[PDB]
Design a protein around this ligand. Sequence first.
Ligand SMILES: O=P(O)(O)OC[C@H]1O[C@H](OP(=O)(O)OP(=O)(O)O)[C@H](O)[C@@H]1O
Ligand SMILES: O=P(O)(O)OC[C@H]1O[C@H](OP(=O)(O)OP(=O)(O)O)[C@H](O)[C@@H]1O
Ligand SMILES: Oc1ncnc2cn[nH]c12
Ligand SMILES: Oc1ncnc2cn[nH]c12
Ligand SMILES: [Mg+2]
Ligand SMILES: [Mg+2]
Ligand SMILES: [Mg+2]
Lengths: 194, 192
Amino acid sequence: YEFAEKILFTEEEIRTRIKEVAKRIADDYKGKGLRPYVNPLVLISVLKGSFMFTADLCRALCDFNVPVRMEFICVSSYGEGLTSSGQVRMLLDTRHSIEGHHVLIVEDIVNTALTLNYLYHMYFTRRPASLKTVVLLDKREGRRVPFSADYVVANIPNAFVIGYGLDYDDTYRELRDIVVLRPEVYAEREAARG
Amino acid sequence: YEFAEKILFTEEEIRTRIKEVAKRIADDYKGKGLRPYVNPLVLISVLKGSFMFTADLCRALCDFNVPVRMEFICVSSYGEGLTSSGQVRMLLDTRHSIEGHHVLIVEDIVNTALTLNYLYHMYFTRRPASLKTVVLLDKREGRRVPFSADYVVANIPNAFVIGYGLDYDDTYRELRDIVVLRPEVYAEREAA
Ligand SMILES: O=P(O)(O)OC[C@H]1O[C@H](OP(=O)(O)OP(=O)(O)O)[C@H](O)[C@@H]1O
Ligand SMILES: O=P(O)(O)OC[C@H]1O[C@H](OP(=O)(O)OP(=O)(O)O)[C@H](O)[C@@H]1O
Ligand SMILES: Oc1ncnc2cn[nH]c12
Ligand SMILES: Oc1ncnc2cn[nH]c12
Ligand SMILES: [Mg+2]
Ligand SMILES: [Mg+2]
Ligand SMILES: [Mg+2]
């Protein structure tokens, strides 16, 4: 990747970590007696960024016999830039009611946590049986609001990361690895954009 | 897989076919001069079924250095027996305009092709540079309206298949493989 400063996690590392977290999730939910049709774990995938993680996580969960029902919502905040707008837009909400169901919000990364804070609050008031969160990446110090995810695959330093669903101006979401974008590359783009 | 009548494709066979299709798409787009930011291949992923296929496909395309821009759309129905033409309600459309862009609609299964034909024609009227479709599975004999997909991963007979994004009553999308749901199970649950 000529545009990368470095590779944080390779595809293999990501796959391995996701498998461990799926195992934890399975153990933790065993007492809930999850069942297809009548009692699945509702996964609320936060588009666009969570699409890849979601695709890989649900298959990992299936390996541990955890029945799931997928819901995709769309939330926007960074747009084409490199920093939070501070405003969270709900472009698409869930199809069905989560009231009375076990729900797990799946996100690719938590930084300022304005997005998850918005989400968690919204769904919390809908009275699900339980509500948890699993984030692929956590920038633990970038917080603007306090938020503690129930499951974190990896903690990362403050640098703009791309790949595996994460984008910079809706570019690079398709990479198999998670890499750090060189500032020279985004600075040249930013200049061209604004 | 107690609920399954038989295994159609394993994760490994699926994985291989997708790479083969991605190689072809990549060659066909070579003349299009695709570039990130300005001229990426826009993939219009039709939720919810194509979520898994899309994640593996964009990675295979990345393997071939094809720059992509991911778009996800969500469609719904107006009601029962309201349209002939496969008209659907757009709940979520593309974030950015497709006019002047090379677009590829990603779907996981085409059978009657009613809604896919409607969607194809809709984006066609928005003037993209080019418009194509890639479908994971094609039930060639089920057409209710003439429709041909530009790339297809596999042709299959008329059997209800589940797994790899495909569901029966929002169940089984998470399977790594594509299997045939026991007809009895489908019949009972459908009537239920
Ligand atoms: O914790 P926060 O600072 O809120 O940042 C994290 C959120 O920001 C990103 O989404 P973005 O707004 O870029 O949308 P996208 O998923 O479509 O890329 C990322 O995918 C998370 O959803
Ligand atoms: O041509 P037919 O056999 O009548 O069915 C056509 C559509 O039905 C399914 O989508 P669905 O409504 O199931 O959406 P989904 O992707 O969210 O499951 C299937 O995935 C096709 O796209
Ligand atoms: O490093 C990063 N990459 C992609 N999206 C975001 C949001 N916050 N921080 C990000
Ligand atoms: O076999 C099949 N499996 C899942 N969804 C659909 C739609 N049409 N045909 C299907
Ligand atoms: Mg996001
Ligand atoms: Mg983003
Ligand atoms: Mg379906």
